[PDB]
Write a protein that binds this ligand. Structure first.
Ligand code: K
Ligand code: MG
Ligand code: MG
Ligand code: MG
Ligand code: MG
Ligand code: MG
Ligand code: MG
Ligand code: MG
Ligand code: MG
Ligand code: MG
Ligand code: MG
Ligand code: MG
Ligand code: MG
Ligand code: MG
Ligand code: MG
Ligand code: MG
Ligand code: MG
Ligand code: ZN
Lengths: 46, 119, 194, 307
RNA sequence: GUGCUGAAAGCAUAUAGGCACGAAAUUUACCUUAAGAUAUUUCUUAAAUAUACGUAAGAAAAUAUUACGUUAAUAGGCUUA
RNA sequence: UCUAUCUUCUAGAGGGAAUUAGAAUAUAAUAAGGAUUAACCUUUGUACGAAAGGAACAUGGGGUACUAUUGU
RNA sequence: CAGGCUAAUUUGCGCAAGAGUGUACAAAAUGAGUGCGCGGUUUGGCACCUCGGCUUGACUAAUCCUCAUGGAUG
């Protein structure tokens, strides 16, 4: 995982999602990829 | 109870006769029979260790009273040790003098096998 | 059903009249020692310590320490031979004598001259000094501990020492040195005798 | 707020109107919740009051030498029982010793009168887990209440030390002794930071003061000997307080309870040694009403001279 | 950080919705102190009770705290071990 | 150099107002603090690896007392 | 000297972009000269205002160890 303020897709298999959002926190924007795990990124800090 | 600057009589055929404790290894409390220390050789006897060498040693008998589970208490008239290497085995091959029987429960078999008498 | 009791009275001293009274209950005057119990358990993990139950509601001995000391001594020394070896009698071992302590689960009895006898009940101990080679070695031994398999007198002092403790023998002037001489002579006299 | 988060006045009693049977959530605070979060650590049985008599060693038949403390039981009785319905928690009130009636007050004289028990010297509550830990009132507890090897916790009052400095009370190192130090060999030194830290001494600052004479608990002490004749329970290790002081002995909370066969064997011995505990209790309660009514009317003197 | 189900968006997705795993931090538990509701088939009609005084102490700068005061082992003495 | 007046602080007290006439004894909810380390062996020379080397998970290491367990 | 304002500078940091290094392959690691910022530790500006050690703390988290964990042709 790489934490950036500017998360970008690096291939056609990367997807933008917002996870860990619940009734207590807003969550983070993620770049998830089933092809290359080196594309995994998170926007925002805990 | 051995601590920094304490002098000990080395009783093995390593070449050292009088060593000074520089560090208690593995604990903060003062070292007793069966504890490792780092010593500096101050006197020799006439690959032997020379004056000024820095080696590890094991306290084999102390002047402070050492109590045991059976209520027995042992006391010697001097503080002695035997030099060892960082591996943990002795440097010399023969020990002249009595050693403390507390070396058994601290995994010092090699030091005891070469010890003639135990107290 | 109603246990025995007595009445305690509180009187008013300004009128010499009974303010209030209460029935104070007393323990059974005649202490009742109930019969043996029928509760029996079958387990390897515990036992019930109901060996000797005293009478109900009776004050136990005030100081059970001396009584507990004689139970342990009688248990650690059934024959009473060790208690007599260090008693304050003429035949007993005195300070200044030479004693050999045999060790249970051990070899090479430690022999030395006795410098002190600390009488502390079950923790009574003797200090023996010797010279194993060129190094002096003092030893405390709890006489009632089971690791002390045996204690023998191998050499008595000619004249009774003028001191309860002989810590001056640490000085080279009065240091007896090694004891292998008296140990050897003692063993020699032993085998030649039987 | 005075205490915690609750602004509720201290004279209001709304508890019985907030019930779970009405569909409301179970509160995380309160007696019911407090007990639930202590069910695993609350002992099943009660304890005993014992007197510290001295320290010694336990000599084993093969070479063991174990330091130990001797605790004597002096006429330990069950005096009362606490229930959730009446008190909000389960507990057994145990007594110790005796006391002269003149020294006991009228309120306590009538408290023992209604129970058929002689006035005791000290009382103490021992918390149990559920209704199975309550015992008949008026039964004597002996050292056999415990078995050899049973681990227990011992609570007592520590030896008092009076006003203690910072070295003894908090372990402060002190200052130098010879290298120019002036009148500050055992002093506490600086007591805080300057303006940037509040311009005040912060609460909780460790300072000289009284030391000792406080309750202290030693946990996980095995029992080495159990003698009913002497009435002693020898436990390993040290115990808080001086000789002759009362201590509280109970099963350890950080350990599993004793086997079920043992808990039932002990309760079965109470019934054998005191089969009339209930018949003698109800008789004492009946007499209390008769004497209580006589005191009210003022005819107590008659009931005393008749016998 | 890691998942199951699963659409908005025919796919995909541990994104919404419905479930779950997971840390020397947190909370509880454990220990002490404080708090003082409450309990007793408790006491009290001028008392219950407390204090003072005296002998003390598991207490101790004062204060306080915990006992005892002849129907008594509180302190001292004496006696024995 | 300074015998601490005040605030804050550490301890201990005198008085008090409590569902309320006042007490003795034992006390709950609750609150404020306290305790707070790391390593080794066993597992196992197992997974991994050509070899050297070498984990993770889990159990135990309170007993020359009880108990538990391993040897004889 | 300290406090206050400021932040050029700093032995304090972050983000963006990506020449280049990485046998291959930008982003495992690495990151020229730069841009946009945070912070108030260093050296300075202004002029509102005329040391170190010992003892004993409290607090921060931008983490040396211990705990959980993603990435790692490498
Ligand atoms: K009443
Ligand atoms: Mg005292
Ligand atoms: Mg000092
Ligand atoms: Mg001076
Ligand atoms: Mg302020
Ligand atoms: Mg994640
Ligand atoms: Mg789908
Ligand atoms: Mg899916
Ligand atoms: Mg507690
Ligand atoms: Mg005083
Ligand atoms: Mg007397
Ligand atoms: Mg003042
Ligand atoms: Mg101030
Ligand atoms: Mg509470
Ligand atoms: Mg065994
Ligand atoms: Mg100016
Ligand atoms: Mg990985
Ligand atoms: Zn991708």
């Amino acid at each position: 995982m790489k934490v950036h303020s500017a998360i970008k897709k690096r291939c056609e298999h990367c997807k933008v999602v917002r996870r860990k959002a619940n009734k207590r926190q807003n969550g983070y924007l993620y770049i998830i990829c089933p092809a290359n795990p080196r594309h995994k990124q998170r926007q925002g800090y805990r | 109870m051995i601590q920094l600057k304490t002098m000990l009589n080395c009783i093995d055929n390593s070449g050292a006769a009088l060593v000074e404790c520089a560090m208690v290894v593995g604990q903060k409390r003062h070292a007793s029979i069966g504890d490792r220390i780092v010593v500096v050789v101050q006197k020799q006897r006439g690959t032997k260790v020379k004056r000024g060498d820095i080696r590890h040693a094991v306290v084999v008998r102390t002047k402070q009273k050492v109590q045991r589970r059976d209520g027995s208490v042992v006391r010697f008239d001097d503080n002695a040790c035997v030099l060892i290497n960082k591996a943990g085995d002795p440097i010399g091959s023969r020990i002249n003098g009595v050693v403390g029987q507390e070396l058994r429960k601290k995994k010092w078999s090699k030091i005891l096998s070469m010890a003639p008498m135990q107290a | 059903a109603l246990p025995d009791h007595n009445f305690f009275r509180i009187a008013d001293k300004h009128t010499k009249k009974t303010r209030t009274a209460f029935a104070v209950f007393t323990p059974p005057k005649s202490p009742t020692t109930l019969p043996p119990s029928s509760v029996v358990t079958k387990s390897k993990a515990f036992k019930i310590a109901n060996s000797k139950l005293p009478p109900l509601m009776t004050k136990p001995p005030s100081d059970p320490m001396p009584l507990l000391t004689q139970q342990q001594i009688a248990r650690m020394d059934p024959t009473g031979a060790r208690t007599a070896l260090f008693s304050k009698a003429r035949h007993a071992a005195r300070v200044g004598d030479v004693l050999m302590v045999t060790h249970r689960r051990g070899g090479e009895p430690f022999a030395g001259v006795c410098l002190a006898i600390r009488r502390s009940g079950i923790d009574t101990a003797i200090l023996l000094r010797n010279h194993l080679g060129k190094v002096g070695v003092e030893m405390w031994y709890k006489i009632y501990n089971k690791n002390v398999a045996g204690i023998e007198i191998i050499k008595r002092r000619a004249k009774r020492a003028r001191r309860a403790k002989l810590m001056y023998m640490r000085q080279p002037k009065h240091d007896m040195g090694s004891v292998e001489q008296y140990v050897f002579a003692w063993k020699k006299m032993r085998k030649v005798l039987s | 707020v005075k205490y915690g988060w609750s602004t509720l006045p201290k004279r209001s009693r709304p508890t019985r109107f907030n019930q779970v049977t009405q569909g409301l959530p179970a509160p995380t605070s309160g007696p019911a919740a407090a007990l639930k979060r202590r069910e695993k650590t609350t002992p099943l049985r009660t304890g005993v009051l014992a007197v510290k008599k001295g320290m010694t060693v336990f000599m084993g038949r093969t070479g063991a030498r174990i330091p130990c403390t001797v605790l004597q039981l002096d006429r330990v009785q069950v005096v009362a029982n606490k229930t959730r319905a009446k008190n909000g928690y389960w507990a057994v009130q145990v007594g110790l010793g005796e006391r002269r009636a003149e020294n006991v007050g009228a309120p306590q004289l009538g408290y023992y009168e209604a129970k058929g028990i002689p006035p005791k010297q000290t009382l103490a509550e021992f918390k149990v887990r559920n209704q199975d830990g309550l015992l008949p009132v008026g039964v004597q507890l002996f050292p056999d209440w415990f078995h050899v090897g049973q681990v227990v916790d011992v609570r007592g009052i520590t030896r008092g030390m009076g006003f203690a400095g910072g070295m003894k009370r908090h372990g402060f190192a002190g200052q130098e002794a010879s290298h120019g130090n002036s009148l500050n060999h055992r002093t506490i030194g600086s007591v805080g930071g300057s303006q940037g830290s509040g311009s005040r001494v912060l609460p909780g600052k460790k300072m000289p003061g009284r030391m000792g004479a406080q309750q202290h608990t030693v946990q996980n002490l095995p029992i080495l000997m159990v003698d009913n004749e002497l009435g002693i329970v020898v436990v390993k290790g040290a115990v808080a307080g001086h000789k002759g002081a009362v201590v509280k002995v109970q099963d350890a909370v950080k350990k599993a309870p004793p086997p079920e066969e043992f808990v039932e064997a002990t309760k079965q011995l109470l019934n054998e040694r005191f089969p009339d505990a209930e018949e003698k209790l109800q008789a004492a309660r009946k007499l209390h009403l008769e004497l209580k009514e006589a005191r009210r009317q003022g005819l107590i003197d008659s009931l005393i001279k008749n016998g």
